[PDB]
Amino acid sequence: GSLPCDICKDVVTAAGDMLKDNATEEEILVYLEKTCDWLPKPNMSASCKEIVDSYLPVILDIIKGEMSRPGEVCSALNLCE
């Protein structure tokens, strides 16, 4: 899969699991930012940050809306084919 697709799957899964543990949205952002910062290449970190900043908000809304399948959520947002 494309890099945006691969990152999206991570983000949606992470956000979903953390919400199911009643994590706060702020904490979720902090967690995902860490992931972005740990990625081994600058282009990966950059793509991760852009995806988190652009899509995490609506992803949280979608999961709260009872839709948490990573592949499906990401395909809908056109991050996956």
Numbering used by the authors: 0 to 80
Please share excerpts from the published article on this structure.
In the absence of lipid or detergent at pH 4.8, SapA is observeed to adopt a conformation closely resembling the previously determined ‘closed’ conformation, showing that pH alone is not sufficient for the transition to the ‘open’ conformation. The asymmetric unit contains two molecules of SapA, both in the closed conformation, with the characteristic saposin fold. Analysis with PDBePISA suggests that the two molecules in the asymmetric unit form a crystallographic pseudodimer and not a stable quaternary complex. This is consistent with observations that SapA remains monomeric at low pH in the absence of detergent. The two chains observed in the asymmetric unit are almost identical, with a backbone r.m.s.d. of 0.46 Å after least-squares alignment. The largest difference was seen at Trp37, which was observed in a dual-occupancy conformation in chain B only, indicating that this side chain is mobile. Comparison of atomic B factors shows that the α3–α4 hinge region is more ordered in both chains of the pH 4.8 structure than in the pH 6.0 structure. There are no large-scale conformational rearrangements accompanying pH change, emphasizing the absolute necessity of lipids or detergents for transition to the open conformation. However, in combination with the structure of closed SapA at pH 6.0, this work reveals regions of conformational flexibility, and the crystal packing suggests a tendency to bury the negatively charged α3 helix at lysosomal pH.
Saposins A, B, C and D comprise a family of small, non-enzymatic lipid-transfer proteins that are essential for the activation of GSL catabolism; genetic defects in saposin function cause specific forms of lysosomal storage diseases. Each saposin shows functional specificity for the activation of certain catabolic reactions: saposin A (SapA) activates the hydrolysis of β-d-galactocerebroside to ceramide and galactose by the enzyme β-galactocerebrosidase. Whilst they share less than 35% sequence identity, they all adopt a common fold consisting of four amphipathic α-helices organized into two ‘fingers’.
